[PDB]
């Protein structure tokens, strides 16, 4: 059992007149670059 996760919750944003960025990202990892 092996887990990688992100939980982001409720954005309350009435009457918006500027700029907002709501960004959520998840990146698995057991990568292996090899150079022989």
């Amino acid at each position: 059992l092996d887990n990688v996760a992100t939980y982001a919750g409720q954005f309350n944003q009435d009457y918006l007149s500027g700029m907002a960025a709501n960004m959520s990202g998840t990146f698995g990892g057991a990568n292996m670059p090899n150079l022989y």
Binding site: M19, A21, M23, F27
Partner: protein
């Protein structure tokens, strides 16, 4: 008595070199507000790999 170019830029990348007689002369020139993984090589073998790039990249004028 060779020379390059003449000018003005705002925001973006600008190349004005004297490149006469070269093999790919001129440079790698990049603009503002950006994401840009970059590689320059002289070799027998060469490999680039990239993933997962997120941005807003926006402008508001009031």
């Amino acid at each position: 008595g060779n020379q390059g170019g003449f000018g003005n830029s705002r925001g973006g990348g600008a190349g004005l070199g004297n490149n006469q007689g070269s093999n790919m002369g001129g440079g790698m020139n990049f603009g503002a507000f950006s994401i840009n993984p970059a590689m320059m090589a002289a070799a027998q073998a060469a490999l680039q790999s990239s993933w997962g790039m997120m941005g807003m990249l926006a402008s508001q004028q009031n």
